[PDB]
């Protein structure tokens, strides 16, 4: 059939396009209602409560020694850094391609983020570029399991242990993913998860989880999330603040909702993994289309699908890849495929990291007089990946999205059947 | 009848002691479920709806909904340019959050002593604590009593300081007829489940008349990004931000609570007035009061006890405090403390480690022992005071507070036993 962009029928009819996420069932509604009526609405509520219940269930499902429920994935990262003694005068190596929270977490704990370039295929921090950027000030590495792909934990943990650095996994985008059969989050000193409403195991709003095998680390995060106070069910409180703490408490209602979601997680995983595999198998046949992949000895959570497009496949060798990216985005959106970008620039190009003002007076950079790259200066692979890639977000997460992803594949095949029109749009 | 502490019948029967707070009605449950089914869980969304309603109800130019009252305070400081090398004067008697908010923005908290009757920061002591590094004052409307905002704003104008009201415990409170939170450069509210206008968990509101201050807080709460409805997220950040976002479900719940606030507030004011009227007649019992030309929110009721009234001259006030707590609790009155020590005594402010390496204190060179005087009023108030929390907030607690007053009058009818225990 003809391209929608030139008057043909869209591959994805409008009545098929909408996807509900989070997927709210009666079990979720009842969990929320029971949390309201339970009269234990806060983390610090004495006795059994939905927050401690989620901590136990998450730890149990993923085999973690300790789980500390917190306000956000960002708070999980910053509290992990605080617990591991990272702070003023320390550097933390993070990927140049991530959600900004990965770069901000070090700043939040008054440490300096140092950006390492990513791998052109995995989109994860390249251990080859991590080694280059270690200094006398480096205290920690935050590998991100970006888009749901576990990072090269062999080489990241090897680098950290060779240099005496801490490892905090940013596993926000990769719940249930494994590296050498180990649940992500449990491989580093600590692991951070986001339960934000867009995530693979969402809450009805905001939420975070910190996991660790280290009891002392867990206890530090437990104090840190509640103004530095010890709060233990049954134990007598002393209302002492033992050190720097915040209000990073998770909501009981959100905890109860995620507990309900977690009971169905692997049923949804089964559907997602089948649906995405079938979708990527069709796109993998299209020349100049690189489907995302799990690295060796890993599984992919498929939180975000990022595709790279080769101009050479459309005879556009020499033309800015961004021209092809824009042409494909326009044609696929006309078919009803909600192709997006995820990050328009590497994190080091963000004003917060370029300006190095931070809290004011250049802190945390001012502690050591540490500098960073100017905008556009470094991280060519992160730039190359952004230049030629489009993403699919949300729609593939729903267990009933099988037929929708086949309609998306119909759209991709239609566009690829009209390479002359792709080339024309790209060249205009 | 004999005292409950020695086998007597309690003035408050066991089956009448329970009080539900927050007060959850079907309207609250429906609001939460409707927000859930609405499929707009992050922040034509419940968060912006609450912002509009709060601003409209209490007459503020701007309202920015955030995760917590603590985040409202720290984002306010950031918005007002408070940071490394700056000092923020806060009360020596408050919730820890008031002292931590400056540390969260890499500024140094400086503790001013409080008033022996209002329990709010003493403006005269604030003036004595001012240095070349002072950038802001956080007056707290502690327990629901508005602070001395005339003197605090006068001091701030003289020294070019920002004023951030900590109105966490004082929703609906007024100062010279003006809603608290709108007098300083900005005002912080907590919607935490224990509060007079609660959410089902955690929540905060930042209010201000200044559009630029509001916009700073709006960006600060969401990683420094500008998020407009219908616009595709470009992830472009314009400065240092956090995840301080309020939950839509919590916002919807507080919107439902607001529809009954005026009725709940009337009940509380009537019930607390009647309760304190009876307790005020007991010698050596000082009931909490609103300062002249202010109204109290009555979030927490703090009572000061005078040993002189039980002829316990020589006996430490803490001894009378302990004796009265034991006897009143035995009768079924859940008398508590609120803060066991002034904030300056808290390990976090004593050790001055902060983020590590003594920051933020390292910037100002405040590594050694705290500058300026002790806080004898804060210590004296803690030494001789007990608090009632939660039970008086429920609009149907009229009869319960009647039984509390029975318990107080009963304990005061046994002064020999009080003196013996003390
Ligand atoms: C089109 C679309 O829907 N877009 C999403 C974008 C969401 C965004 O990717 C999410 C939620 O902010 N990323 C959170 C996150 C965090 C911090 O967790 P947090 O503090 O709990 O947030 C740390 N690390 C990584 C890798 C993360 O991904 C929307 O606009 O919500
Ligand atoms: C017997 C009893 O239950 N008591 C309570 C007491 C709670 C405590 O007073 C509350 C907790 O929310 N006060 C919070 C608060 C904040 C921070 O707001 P936040 O970040 O929104 O919390 C800032 N300022 C002032 C004056 C505050 O009071 C318990 O011990 O939990």
Distances (CA, A) of B380 to A238, A413, B169: 20, 79, 22
The helix (H) or strand (E) run that includes residue B100 is: helix B96-104
Which chain B residue has the Cα nearest residue A247?
B70
Question: What is the number of CB-based contacts under 8 A between chain A and chain B?
Answer: 207
The Cα B211–Cα B90 span in angstroms is 25
Cβ pair B226, B75 in contact under 8 A: no
Query: In 3D, which of A49, A130, A87 has the Cα closest to residue A244?
Result: A87
Query: In 3D, which of B164, B61, B55 has the Cα closest to residue B104?
Result: B164
- Cα B76 to ligand 1 centroid, rounded to whole Å: 24
Contacts of B90 in chain A (CB under 8 A): none
Query: In 3D, which of A156, A200, A244, A122 has the Cα closest to residue A399?
Result: A200
Chain CA centroid to CA A387, Å? 20
The Cα A269–Cα A275 span in angstroms is 10
* Residue A73 marked in a binding site: yes
- Coil, helix or strand for B422? coil
State the residue for tokens 């707290």.
B140
CB contact under 8 A, A101 and B243: yes
Resolution of this entry, Å: 1.8
3-state secondary structure chain A: CCCHHHCCCCCCCHHHCCCCCCCCCHHHHHHHHHHHHHCCCECCCCCCCHHHHHHHHHHHHHCCCEEEEECCHHHHHHHHHHHCCCCCCCEEEEECCCCHHHHHHHHHCCCEEEEECECCCCCCECHHHHHHHCCCCEEEECCECHHHCCCCHHHHHHHHHHHCCEEEEECCCCCCCEECCEECCCCCCEEEEECCCCCCCCCCCCCEEEEECCHHHHHHHHHHCECCCCCCCCCCCCCCCCCCCCECCCEHHHHHHHHHHHHHHHHHHHHHHHHHHHHHHHHCCCCCEECCCCCCCECCCCCEEEEEECHHHHCCCCCCHHHHHHHHHHHHHHHCCCCECCCCCCHHHCHHHHHCCCCECCECHHHCCCCCCCCCCCCHHHHHHHHHEEEEECHHHCCCCHHHHHHHHHHHHHHHCCHHHHHHHHHC
Question: Which of B201, B245, B356 is facing A252, going by the closest CB pair?
Answer: B201
- Is A110 at the interface with chain B, CB within 8 A? yes
Question: Which of B235, B245, B356 is facing A85, going by the closest CB pair?
Answer: B356
As given in the structure block, the two tokens for residue B409 are: 């009058």
CB proximity list for A266: less than 8 A, separation 6 or greater: A176
CA angle A356, A357, A358 (to 5 degrees): 95
As given in the structure block, the two tokens for residue B259 are: 């529809």
The Cα B50–Cα B254 span in angstroms is 7
Cβ pair A131, A159 in contact under 8 A: yes
Which chain A residue has the Cα nearest residue B22?
A39
With the CA atoms of A261, A265, A270 and A272 taken in that order, what torsion angle do they form, in degrees rounded to the nearest 10?
60
- Is B234 at the interface with chain A, CB within 8 A? yes
Which chain A residue has the Cα nearest residue B251?
A205
CA distance A351 to chain B (A): 6
As given in the structure block, the two tokens for residue A245 are: 């703490």
Rounded to 5 degrees, φ, ψ at B416 are: -60, -45
Cβ pair A12, A337 in contact under 8 A: yes
Question: Which of B106, B193, B248 is facing A41, going by the closest CB pair?
Answer: B193
Chain CA centroid to CA A10, Å? 31
- Coil, helix or strand for B51? helix
Ligand nearest the Cα of residue B69 is 2
The Cα B283–Cα B219 span in angstroms is 53
- Is A237 at the interface with chain B, CB within 8 A? no
Cis peptide upstream of residue A178 (ω within 30 degrees of 0): no
End-to-end CA distance of chain A: 24
CA distance A180 to chain B (A): 32
CB contact under 8 A, B357 and A28: no
Question: Which of B41, B81, B104 is facing A205, going by the closest CB pair?
Answer: B41
Contacts of B104 in chain A (CB under 8 A): 246
3-state secondary structure B190-259: ECCCCCCCCCCCCCEEEEECCHHHHHHHHHHCECCECCCCCCCCCCCECCCCCECCCCHHHHHHHHHHHC
The helix (H) or strand (E) run that includes residue B63 is: strand B62-66
Mutate to test the interface with B, among A54, A247, A346 (most CBs of B within 10 A): A247
CA distance B90 to chain A (A): 16
Experimental technique of record: X-ray
Query: In 3D, which of A81, A83, A261, A257 has the Cα closest to residue A175?
Result: A261
Counting beta carbons within 10 angstroms of the beta carbon of residue B300, is it exposed (0 to 12), middle (13 to 18) or buried (19 or more)? Answer: buried
CB contact under 8 A, A206 and B239: no
Residue A210: how many other CB atoms lie within 10 Å: 33
Query: In 3D, which of B76, B95, B69 has the Cα closest to residue B192?
Result: B69
Which chain A residue has the Cα nearest residue B357?
A88
Rounded to 5 degrees, φ, ψ at A194 are: -100, 135
CA distance A62 to chain B (A): 25
**DSSP letter at B12?**
S
Q: Is A414 assigned a catalytic role?
A: no
């Amino acid at each position: 059939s003809k391209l929608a962009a030139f008057g043909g029928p869209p591959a994805v009819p409008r009545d098929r396009r909408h996807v509900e996420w989070p997927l709210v069932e009666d079990e979720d509604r009842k969990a929320v209602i029971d949390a309201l009526d339970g009269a234990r609405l806060v983390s610090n509520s004495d006795g059994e409560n939905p927050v401690s219940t989620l901590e136990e269930q998450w730890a149990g499902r993923f085999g973690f020694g300790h789980c500390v429920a917190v306000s956000t994935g960002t708070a999980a990262l910053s509290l992990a850094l605080a617990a591991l003694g990272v702070g003023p005068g320390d550097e933390v190596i993070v990927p140049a391609l991530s959600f900004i929270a990965t770069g901000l977490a070090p700043v939040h704990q008054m440490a300096v983020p140092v950006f390492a370039d990513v791998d052109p295929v995995t989109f994860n921090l390249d251990p080859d570029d991590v080694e280059r950027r270690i200094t006398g000030r480096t205290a920690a590495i935050i590998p991100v399991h970006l888009h749901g792909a576990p990072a090269d934990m062999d080489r990241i943990t090897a680098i950290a242990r060779r240099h005496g650095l801490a490892v905090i996994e940013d596993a926000a985008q990769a719940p249930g993913a494994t590296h050498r059969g180990r649940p992500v989050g449990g491989i580093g000193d600590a692991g951070a998860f986001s339960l934000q409403a867009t995530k693979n195991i969402p809450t009805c709003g905001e939420g975070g989880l910190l996991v660790t095998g280290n009891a002392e680390l867990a206890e530090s995060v437990r104090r840190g999330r509640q103004f530095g106070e010890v709060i233990e069910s049954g134990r007598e409180r002393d209302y002492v603040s033992y050190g720097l703490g915040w209000n990073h408490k998770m909501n009981a209602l959100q905890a109860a909702f995620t507990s309900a979601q977690l009971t169905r997680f692997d049923d949804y995983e089964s559907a997602r993994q089948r649906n995405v595999a079938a979708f990527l198998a069709r796109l993998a046949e299209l020349p100049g289309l690189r489907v995302p992949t799990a690295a060796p000895d890993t599984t992919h959570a498929w939180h975000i699908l990022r595709f790279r497009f080769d101009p050479a496949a459309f005879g556009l060798d020499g033309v800015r890849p961004q021209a092809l990216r824009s042409a494909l985005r326009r044609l696929l959106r006309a078919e009803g495929v909600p192709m997006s970008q995820y990050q328009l620039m590497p994190l080091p190009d963000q004003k917060v990291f370029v300006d190095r003002v931070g809290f004011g007076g250049g802190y945390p950079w001012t502690v050591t007089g540490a500098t960073g790259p100017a905008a556009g200066e470094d991280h060519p692979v992160a730039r190359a990946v952004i230049a030629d890639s489009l993403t699919l977000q949300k729609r593939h997460l729903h267990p009933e999205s099988g037929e929708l992803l086949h309609l998306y594949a119909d759209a991709f095949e239609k566009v690829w059947a009209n390479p002359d029109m792709v080339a024309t749009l790209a060249g205009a």
